[PDB]
Amino acid sequence: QEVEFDIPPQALGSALQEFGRQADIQVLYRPEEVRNKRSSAIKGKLEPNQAITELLRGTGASVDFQGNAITISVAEAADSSVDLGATMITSNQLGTITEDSGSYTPGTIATATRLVLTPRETPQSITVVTRQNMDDFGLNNIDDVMRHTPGITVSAYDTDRNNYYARGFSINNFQYDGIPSTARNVGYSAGNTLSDMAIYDRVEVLKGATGLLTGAGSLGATINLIRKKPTHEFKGHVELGAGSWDNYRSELDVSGPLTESGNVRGRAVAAYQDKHSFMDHYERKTSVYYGILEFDLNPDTMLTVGADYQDNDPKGSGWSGSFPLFDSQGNRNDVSRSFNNGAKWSSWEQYTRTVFANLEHNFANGWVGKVQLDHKINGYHAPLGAIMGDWPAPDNSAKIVAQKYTGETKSNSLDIYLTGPFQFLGREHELVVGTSASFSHWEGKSYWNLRNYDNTTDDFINWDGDIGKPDWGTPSQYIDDKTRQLGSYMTARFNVTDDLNLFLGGRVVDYRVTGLNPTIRESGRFIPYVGAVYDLNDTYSVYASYTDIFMPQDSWYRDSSNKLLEPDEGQNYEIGIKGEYLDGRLNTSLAYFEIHEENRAEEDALYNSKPTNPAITYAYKGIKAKTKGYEAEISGELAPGWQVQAGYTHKIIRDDSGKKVSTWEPQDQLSLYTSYKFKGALDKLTVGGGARWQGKSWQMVYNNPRSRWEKFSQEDYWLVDLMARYQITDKLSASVNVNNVFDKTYYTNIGFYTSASYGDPRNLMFSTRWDF
Numbered sequence: 001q002e003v004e005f006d007i008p009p010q011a012l013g014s015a016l017q018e019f020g021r022q023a024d025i026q027v028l029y030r031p032e033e034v035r036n037k038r039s040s041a042i043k044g045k046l047e048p049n050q051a052i053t054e055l056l057r058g059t060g061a062s063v064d065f066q067g068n069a070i071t072i073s074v075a076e077a078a079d080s081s082v083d084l085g086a087t088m089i090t091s092n093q094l095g096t097i098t099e100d101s102g103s104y105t106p107g108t109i110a111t112a113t114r115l116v117l118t119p120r121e122t123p124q125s126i127t128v129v130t131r132q133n134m135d136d137f138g139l140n141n142i143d144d145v146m147r148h149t150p151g152i153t154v155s156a157y158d159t160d161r162n163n164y165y166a167r168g169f170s171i172n173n174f175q176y177d178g179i180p181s182t183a184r185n186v187g188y189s190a191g192n193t194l195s196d197m198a199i200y201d202r203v204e205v206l207k208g209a210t211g212l213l214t215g216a217g218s219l220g221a222t223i224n225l226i227r228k229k230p231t232h233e234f235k236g237h238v239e240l241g242a243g244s245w246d247n248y249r250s251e252l253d254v255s256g257p258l259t260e261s262g263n264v265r266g267r268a269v270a271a272y273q274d275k276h277s278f279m280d281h282y283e284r285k286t287s288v289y290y291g292i293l294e295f296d297l298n299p300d301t302m303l304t305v306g307a308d309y310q311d312n313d314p315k316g317s318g319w320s321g322s323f324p325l326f327d328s329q330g331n332r333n334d335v336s337r338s339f340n341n342g343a344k345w346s347s348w349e350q351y352t353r354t355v356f357a358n359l360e361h362n363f364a365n366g367w368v369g370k371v372q373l374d375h376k377i378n379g380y381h382a383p384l385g386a387i388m389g390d391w392p393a394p395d396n397s398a399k400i401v402a403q404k405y406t407g408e409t410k411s412n413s414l415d416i417y418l419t420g421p422f423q424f425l426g427r428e429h430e431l432v433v434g435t436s437a438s439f440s441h442w443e444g445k446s447y448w449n450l451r452n453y454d455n456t457t458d459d460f461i462n463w464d465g466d467i468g469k470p471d472w473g474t475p476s477q478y479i480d481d482k483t484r485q486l487g488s489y490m491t492a493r494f495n496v497t498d499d500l501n502l503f504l505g506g507r508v509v510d511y512r513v514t515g516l517n518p519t520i521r522e523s524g525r526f527i528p529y530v531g532a533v534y535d536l537n538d539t540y541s542v543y544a545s546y547t548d549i550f551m552p553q554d555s556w557y558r559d560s561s562n563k564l565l566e567p568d569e570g571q572n573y574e575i576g577i578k579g580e581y582l583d584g585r586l587n588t589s590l591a592y593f594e595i596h597e598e599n600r601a602e603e604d605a606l607y608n609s610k611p612t613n614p615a616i617t618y619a620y621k622g623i624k625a626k627t628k629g630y631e632a633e634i635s636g637e638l639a640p641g642w643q644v645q646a647g648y649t650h651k652i653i654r655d656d657s658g659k660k661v662s663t664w665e666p667q668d669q670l671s672l673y674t675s676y677k678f679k680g681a682l683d684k685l686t687v688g689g690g691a692r693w694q695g696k697s698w699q700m701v702y703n704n705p706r707s708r709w710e711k712f713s714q715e716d717y718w719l720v721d722l723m724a725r726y727q728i729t730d731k732l733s734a735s736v737n738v739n740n741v742f743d744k745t746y747y748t749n750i751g752f753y754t755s756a757s758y759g760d761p762r763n764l765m766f767s768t769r770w771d772f
């Protein structure tokens with residue numbers, strides 16, 4: 001539908017970038033093709049496809065319409081053979097918006113290098129959950145997304161915190177709009193497991209070792225969440241929802257031009273959710289507001305300012321698990337899926353807010369620059385109280401552990417980068433060069449010295465959460481942890497031949513953890529990034545990459561000598577083939593990857609047996625560890641109204657002990673999510689289903705009362721989702737999702753501090769969405 005245009009004749013480059021903006025569409029073109037060319041005038045309200053053919057008039061250029069992207073090409077009657085991965089500059093530095101693409105495969109992406117590249121161009125495993133996927137499958141928060149993300153396994157620490165493994169590792173790398181947060185521990189990290197999907201276009205997950213743009217982080221993966229953006233045409237929707245266990249949700253999303261010309265624009269969202277659960281006495285209100293204003297200082301300088309805010313506010317939160325495995329005498333406990341060992345008043349509320357600003361500028365060059373400022377708060381308020389220990393006892397009584405943690409973390413980030421093309425041996429290449437600084441400050445209070453509490457209860461079998469609330473007494477501890485991260489990075493992408501793209505970069509890193517622990521310091525650390533992509537046909541490419549990452553150890557991971565262990569460090573080695581079809585409407589990837597860890601913190605038993613250095617009392621050892629496996633995925637259009645996303649991941653990870661590690665992460669996993677839009681009589685109907693399988697997994701947990709280690713197993717299980725949607729009316733639709741159709745009862749945690757969590761039983765969600 002028609003858009004308001006005004007692009008005066010100028011370099012075809014500026015015109016192409018000015019078009020991308022005014023049209024909310026991403027424009028890709030080759031620098032050396034548009035250089036000495038100029039665009040013809042376009043003026044007025046217009047349909048975008050008329051607009052571009054009108055803009056290119058006189059220029060030799062053609063247009064490949066590609067959903068939210070158009071790519072401009074200029075054909076020659078020469079054409080010696082084709083350069084499919086030729087260097088292409090790009091109007092949207094985050095890549096292609098997925099909203100209204102109607103697809104499950106992503107458009108372009110810059111998760112890997114800061115350079116906008118398509119998944120066939122990206123020489124690392126990159127999986128993306130697209131805006132429409134989130135819509136069709138009910139994926140309302142990051143937990144729901146991860147569960148539906150190929151290669152990811154979500155396991156539970158407690159009601160208010162989950163865990164995401166990839167390739168043998170706990171992911172601790174989150175970004176927002178490509179900006180790393182600090183996530184050293186749960187301190188800095190409040191509400192990361194919980195982000196609402198309402199403010200986002202999509203979450204892109206880079207799996208492997210992602211040091212280059214993450215800086216210091218964990219192995220396995222980065223989860224980069226991309227924010228929703230304002231647009232030039234007015235539009236929004238209102239959505240209202242209702243599912244199993246008094247789970248109710250509203251959501252408002254509004255966006256467009258805020259002045260007659262269009263040079264300031266805004267988008268706003270609020271969503272609210274209040275739900276109980278299968279688990280007894282658990283309930284949880286979340287609120288989310290977001291707001292973004294875009295200003296065009298002038299047509300090649302844009303200033304963006306905005307804020308978001310989320311509060312997660314639960315009741316009956318548990319600390320660890322849903323109930324304890326063994327009782328007082330050592331027998332495995334057997335309890336309803338509703339059992340919830342947290343107190344009625346127990347809360348692990350976790351909150352988040354961001355004030356940010358960006359300036360982005362286009363240089364005559366066709367080079368573009370961007371400055372990003374972030375102020376971020378992660379807060380928690382956790383007066384927790386639950387049953388732990390080896391309970392119940394023969395007489396049915398049990399004991400509460402109740403402690404209270406409050407705190408807040410304030411962050412500031414500046415990031416700057418410059419991106420552009422450049423000629424070298426008579427071919428076109430691109431470079432990114434960036435610098436970044438983050439300072440972040442955790443300040444907390446703890447309470448364990450409880451005045452005059454009687455923490456026993458007289459009925460385990462009927463635990464209602466109905467216990468007293470203690471006198472927290474005075475603070476027990478005061479936290480003060482300041483991290484400082486600086487880094488500078490560089491990648492070049494050489495178009496070496498018409499089939500070979502060579503990727504060369506690094507990041508140099510400075511990292512300081514200051515406060516109540518002895519200082520932790522790592523200076524001038526270098527993180528390599530070497531990769532290549534060789535084209536085989538119009539369809540298939542092979543790629544191989546070598547990527548690195550490290551993370552300075554927690555202060556409490558010292559050795560025999562009482563020396564902080566050296567940074568936890570990894571190299572992902574990856575070789576693979578990617579396939580592309582139907583003009584990028586469908587994508588396939590088959591990969592073999594390997595991970596080499598070093599300094600994986602490990603207890604050190606011989607020593608801990610009997611402390612001899614009185615300096616340390618419980619020392620660790622840094623060992624090596626190795627992850628080997630392969631992965632296949634597919635995403636996009638299988639036929640005309642028929643989308644899938646599917647994956648298959650295999651891994652084993654062992655350490656120098658030889659023994660398997662991360663054994664709760666299954667060794668083999670599988671995801672297939674599909675929907676179909678009929679045509680003709682039924683063309684208002686959309687039908688959807690999905691399955692996720694994973695094989696055997698387990699923990700060794702120690703039955704204390706019996707004085708022996710036991711293995712707990714979760715037998716391989718399927719989970720099936722079903723989905724239908726009918727568009728009754730132009731402006732109004734009604735959906736239903738049913739998850740876990742066969743009501744499979746399984747475990748999402750066995751073994752976390754000797755407890756267990758059950759996965760969601762069958763649940764339905766009903767909703768209507770209304771578009772103005």
Ligand SMILES: CCCCCCCCOCCOCCOCCOCCOCCO
Pocket residue numbers: 234254255256257258265266267268290291292293305306307355
């Ligand atoms: C220092 C704090 C920075 C916070 C920035 C937050 C900005 C919040 O502003 C919300 C703007 O949203 C714009 C809503 O867009 C709706 C467009 O419709 C306009 C009215 O339509 C009239 C006839 O169509």
Ligand SMILES: CCCCCCCCOCCOCCOCCOCCOCCO
Pocket residue numbers: 734735736738743762763764766767768
């Ligand atoms: C352990 C218990 C789980 C129960 C399992 C139930 C699964 C079967 O449910 C089938 C759902 O079909 C009901 C169809 O209702 C249609 C919904 O229409 C939406 C209304 O929108 C109103 C618009 O204003």
